[PDB]
Amino acid sequence: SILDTYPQICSPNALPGTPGNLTKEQEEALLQFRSILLEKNYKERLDDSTLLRFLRARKFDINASVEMFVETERWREEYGANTIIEDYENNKEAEDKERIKLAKMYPQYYHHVDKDGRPLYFEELGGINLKKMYKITTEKQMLRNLVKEYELFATYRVPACSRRAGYLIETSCTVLDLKGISLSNAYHVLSYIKDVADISQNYYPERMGKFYIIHSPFGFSTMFKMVKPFLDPVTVSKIFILGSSYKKELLKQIPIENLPVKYGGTSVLHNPNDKFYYSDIGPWRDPRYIGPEGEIPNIFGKFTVTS
């Protein structure tokens, strides 16, 4: 299997409960957890990385972890997550056309990695015109896009970044740029944010590495109080709302050469005419780190910037 072509143990200096950094009791819980799922006849996604993510999300309470894993398998099957990349590929032409329309208005792109080797993810909400967005896309479509990325993240980005880091990478480093948004719109999209939180927390536990929110307007703390209610304790702890010193905070976690110039870094596209919202640069593009899983599909079609 592909799991054999990249590190399956995290850095020895990663958080507790991660692959290769278990206590005796955690190691035993894992074996018992996998034993129960095997007995229930599950076959897929029973690797240490996956199972430990569920165990951590439930504090190694085995039965509560089994319930969570069982529900996730059902959901993946009913929602179509198990074939989402395949389905996308079978209709690439059309999906890419739709994707390119929203790219400039709602930038979502990966750009290298943080200091621990985690994929560096950026999203800018400032140029979003809700009226125009509802006219060209739907919330369900965007949720689909989210689920597809979780799958792309696991099959392409993780193996590549892990081979480059020399150890298992299970999470990402996300930067949410809120410069230019209206709190008004923020409140208007609460239900969508709630849907994102539910998919993430229920079916993709422990995928959050670092989550920074920069350029948030005054009074964002108020609106965020509306969001915390449906976020789990661990999720909140991974979210950091930065102030005017955000650049110094980002530079502690991200190599300056990987950080875009406008965020305090020195990273520039090889062609200062390409747009960051059409880019997908990272280890998953380096032939030296791409394995039997093959290279990740190009989300922005012919426009996809791979440098």
Curated annotation (Swiss-Prot):
Domain CRAL-TRIO: 98-271
Gene3D superfamilies (alphabetical): CRAL-TRIO lipid binding domain, N-terminal domain of phosphatidylinositol transfer protein sec14p
Any one biological process term the GO annotation gives: post-Golgi vesicle-mediated transport
GO cellular component terms, A-Z: nucleus
InterPro entries in alphabetical order: CRAL-TRIO_dom, CRAL-TRIO_dom_sf, CRAL/TRIO_N_dom, CRAL/TRIO_N_dom_sf, PI/PC_transfer
Domain of life: Eukaryota
SMART domains, per the entry: CRAL_TRIO_N, SEC14
GO molecular function terms listed in the Swiss-Prot or TrEMBL record: phosphatidylcholine binding; phosphatidylinositol binding; phosphatidylinositol transfer activity
Membrane-spanning segments: none
Additional free-text comment from the UniProt record: Present with 2870 molecules/cell in log phase SD medium.
PANTHER family: CRAL-TRIO DOMAIN-CONTAINING PROTEIN YKL091C-RELATED (PTHR45657:SF1)
Protein name in UniProt: CRAL-TRIO domain-containing protein YKL091C
Species this protein is from: Saccharomyces cerevisiae (strain ATCC 204508 / S288c) (Baker's yeast)
Record lineage: Eukaryota, Fungi, Dikarya, Ascomycota, Saccharomycotina
